[PDB]
């Protein structure tokens, strides 16, 4: 997205916010690189974030935002419906249901792929 290539990235904190380990040690006492929120800089092991290997690869190439920082990729807002924002299971971008193309009135069932990822 043109607006992801444009917001600067915060200084990463080299500690997992969930388990307090570093890149040297996750919850299984194995090394694992962190991913860091572009807006707040806080970090997590992909395994602590419960991300699949495939999702992990994709988010490391994007201006990834944590759960609380996530803004809608269409309207750039969080807003009153923030908590019901959908997260793409391919790239982890957020979309309000009403901001999807086409707009949705009910929550999708199962794994959900966003308008950017779907072919």
């Amino acid at each position: 997205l043109p607006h992801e290539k444009d917001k600067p990235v915060a200084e990463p904190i080299p500690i997992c916010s969930f388990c307090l380990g570093t890149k040297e040690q996750n919850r299984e006492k194995k090394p694992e690189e962190l991913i860091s929120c572009a807006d707040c800089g806080n970090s997590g092991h992909p395994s602590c974030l419960k991300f699949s290997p495939e999702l992990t690869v994709r988010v490391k190439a994007l201006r990834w935002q944590c759960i609380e920082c996530k803004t809608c990729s269409s309207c750039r807002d969080q807003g009153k419906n923030a908590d019901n924002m959908l997260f793409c299971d391919s790239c982890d971008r957020g979309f309000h249901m009403e901001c999807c193309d086409p707009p949705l009135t009910r929550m999708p069932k199962g794994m959900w792929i966003c308008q950017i990822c779907r072919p």
Binding site: F18, K50, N84
Partner: peptide, 25 residues
């Protein structure tokens, strides 16, 4: 689908913030 709300729950809680600051120092 995952939402912000359901992802918050399914991920599990963050560690106590005082413990994170203690490790950051």
């Amino acid at each position: 689908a995952r939402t912000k709300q359901t992802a918050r729950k399914s991920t599990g809680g963050k560690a106590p913030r005082k413990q994170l600051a203690t490790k950051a120092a």
